[PDB]
Design an enzyme around this catalytic site. Structure first.
Site, PDB file in Angstrom:
ATOM      1  N   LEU A  62     -22.519 -22.500 -19.473  1.00 18.14           N
ATOM      2  CA  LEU A  62     -21.965 -21.473 -18.587  1.00 18.14           C
ATOM      3  C   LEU A  62     -20.418 -20.568 -19.565  1.00 18.14           C
ATOM      4  CD1 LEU A  62     -22.054 -22.004 -14.297  1.00 18.14           C
ATOM      5  CD2 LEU A  62     -23.761 -20.489 -16.881  1.00 18.14           C
TER       6      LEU A  62
ATOM      7  N   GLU B 163     -36.213 -33.946 -21.249  1.00 20.92           N
ATOM      8  CA  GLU B 163     -35.896 -34.174 -19.674  1.00 20.92           C
ATOM      9  C   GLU B 163     -36.821 -33.300 -18.407  1.00 20.92           C
ATOM     10  OE1 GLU B 163     -32.196 -34.342 -17.879  1.00 20.92           O
ATOM     11  OE2 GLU B 163     -32.938 -33.135 -15.682  1.00 20.92           O
TER      12      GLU B 163
END
Lengths: 440, 440
Positions: free
Chosen positions: B324, B249
């Site tokens: 995260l 991407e």
């Protein structure tokens, strides 16, 4: 090649057929009606006798057939459910376990149904597969009947494939749906009606809901109908259409009625032109009987049927799914168990994605706006935990109060339009919650 | 045909260029370095003077150029951020707004990045699009340079397209990357270096992580990865590989280093053989200069690059993404804002899905096991609310303590294996939590 001799050679009793399944091995079986009762009763008996242990059973779409045999709570220590959908049967087991000293008794295996054939064959590994089949034909083939799904694949990947011949299982045509006698290790015969989905009554909300949806179904639509009473019943508002197609995960009575009525021709489809495509079927006896030798119905494996790239190939796809809750972000939840998310394993999202990607396609998720005789709102501030359909994927949401296309709407625009789909009794309370969440 | 005559007719000042944008209209712009600083300054000035209002700006991947000008808090009443990614810039605005009488000042538009071209062009509709471009070539074409994404579609679908020519913008080859002057409505010129992704220092955990990840990359692997010290370190370890491919991407300095070294050849890809494919690029000046006129780098639009069906056509895809938090169910969270989920709009899940579907493919999601000087665990019992990567989609997770493939594992097997990736200081607590959640 003499098929009659091969048959007699493999034909046996349920008892002997399951007698060789190893302790500590992995077994799977067909979905729903496909679950073979004679074979599962005999397997349950083995466990009851204490003659097998540490048997993991990996499966989707439980039926009373399994619920009452291998899955009985008393056998939980010997036949361990590695359930890949959590249904009413598993919910009952889980609650019983909690009561019994907080025991874990169902081992949920997170997955995408659309990946089940690969997951079971390649990641998990299945040693024994069991499935009800239509009687062997004069060319030596059985049919998986109401089941394709991951069954066509695991029937071949498993070291042993054991079939339960049932004259009540329709002979269905499909990709890998036919099984040659040479691919079968053992055979038992048990002729009994297939288990049925309960018949459900329409509620008043379905009239408005069905009307709203009808206005959203374009000419030559290619239908998928999700599981549940709502999509099955909403199907009936399309009785007056022509040249519809079917490419669905589950084939239900409502869809088969449209076939019966000549509404579905499948002539406007790009893929499987002329044939109604499904991956497994659930219904009542009338539907099962109708599927037998039907030349315009064609089952395919779930990794084809539920691939959004495949779904999208057909123009004007309409996916009609139901949900239990919609929150103010536009996310939807189909999971019965509060604070859990097992329903995401289902193919709902595959079709939400696939329908939107279809040229002219529409995904619709629908629900009555209330529950419990109007005392409980199914439109809520925020879903508790992980969702079924994420807010980034929702397209069209419908209640008896109207429809909203959520795509491209901001979080403020979404919350306002969604509140208006709630019952008047709850709009003020929802508007305040939206303010508190800072959605508006 | 007379392109210099057309250029001279269209060339104007930033102030004049943005002067005809209607109030109550929809504007979009390129991503990151693509944002045009002179045009955005002129638009912000227009708001400052009170000469425009109710302007919605729909956009992804914010940069300081945008934050400094149009997105300035003081202009929030005239230029409305309809942010489609929530980044550091929007987090600052959102928090400031809550402080300022609990005001809503960012209007998140939920979406999939992979559907951005269609969503912006069709459901939302864009009246004006602005993007920095390379200088016009002798055939009359400008290049979108660092950006393709949804930009190549919206440049054509927007009712007006305004370019900011910058000699620092590389002339990049790609699908619809080049736009003819006949398709451009107005031109300004502003030659300034492109904004850079800051180079961040590596943490110790990245050493072990980069090696575990690298061990999971075979020769001939087709890479996607994000930006940061970790991917740079992974690429460092991969300098010994051969015949790697790129289908990513975001194109980052680490990947470009492998191209420069001859490590990436793209000869084993099925699609775009011989060329490194990306949808937008972020990095530093050295990387930007390198992209200029490179015959083996080829940008493509996001609805191609991030289509899981397309990703999966290349064999041995390796997707490397960061997160995260990871919870004991195997779900991952990349959202910085507690209780919220805006990061699900990003392409992470596209590549998680696509890499798994690839023959020989692997999706990796990696994180250090702790934060805050080891005082906080990033492996947690349960993510607070909607997730970034659902537990049904996670493939491989990695911390400094090793790797786990979650596919096909029960909830119990997942929890037990995931705990072993947590820091030793937290394993006992996580085991207790797992028991309370009834995972084990």
């Amino acid at each position: 090649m003499d098929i009659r001799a091969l048959y007699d050679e493999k034909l046996t009793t349920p008892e002997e057929a399951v007698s060789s399944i190893a302790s500590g091995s992995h077994l799977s079986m067909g979905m729903f009606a496909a679950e073979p009762p004679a074979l599962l009763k005999a397997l349950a008996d083995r466990a009851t006798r204490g003659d097998i242990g540490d048997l993991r059973v990996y499966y989707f779409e439980t039926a009373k057939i399994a619920g009452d045999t291998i899955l009985r709570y008393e056998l939980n220590n010997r036949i361990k459910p590695y359930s890949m959908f959590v249904t009413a049967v598993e919910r009952a087991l889980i609650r019983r376990g909690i009561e019994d000293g907080g025991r874990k008794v169902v081992n949920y295996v997170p997955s995408n149904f659309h990946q089940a054939p690969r997951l079971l064959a390649e990641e998990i590994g299945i040693d024994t597969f069991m499935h009800t089949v239509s009687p062997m034909d004069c060319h030596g083939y059985f049919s998986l009947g109401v089941g394709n799904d991951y069954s066509s694949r695991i029937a071949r990947s498993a070291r042993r494939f054991i079939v339960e011949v049932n004259r009540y299982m329709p002979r269905v045509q499909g990709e890998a749906a036919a099984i040659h006698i040479s691919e079968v290790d053992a055979i038992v015969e048990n002729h009994v009606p297939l288990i049925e989905m309960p018949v459900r009554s329409a509620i008043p909300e379905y009239t408005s809901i069905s009307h709203i949806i009808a206005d959203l179904v374009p000419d030559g639509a290619c239908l998928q109908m999700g599981v549940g009473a709502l999509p099955n019943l909403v199907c009936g508002v399309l009785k007056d259409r022509n040249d519809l197609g079917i490419h669905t995960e589950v084939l239900n009575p409502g869809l088969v009625d449209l076939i019966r009525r000549g509404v579905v021709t499948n002539q406007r489809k790009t893929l499987d032109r002329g044939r109604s495509v499904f991956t497994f079927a659930m219904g009542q006896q009338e539907m099962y009987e109708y599927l037998n030798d039907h030349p315009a119905i064609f089952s395919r494996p779930v990794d084809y049927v539920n691939d959004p790239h495949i779904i999208a190939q057909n123009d004007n796809v309409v996916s009609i799914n139901a949900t239990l809750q919609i929150d103010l972000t536009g996310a939807c939840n189909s999971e019965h168990m509060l604070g859990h998310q097992y329903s995401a394993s289902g193919g709902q999202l595959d079709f939400v994605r696939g329908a939107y990607a279809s040229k002219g396609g529409r995904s619709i998720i629908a629900t009555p706006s209330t529950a419990a005789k109007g005392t409980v709102s199914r439109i809520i501030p925020r879903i508790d935990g992980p969702v079924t359909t994420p807010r980034i994927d929702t397209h069209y949401i419908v209640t008896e109060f109207g429809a909203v296309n959520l795509k491209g709407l901001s979080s403020t625009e979404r919350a306002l339009r969604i509140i208006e789909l709630a019952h008047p009794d709850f709009r003020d309370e929802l508007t305040q919650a939206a303010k508190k969440m800072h959605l508006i």
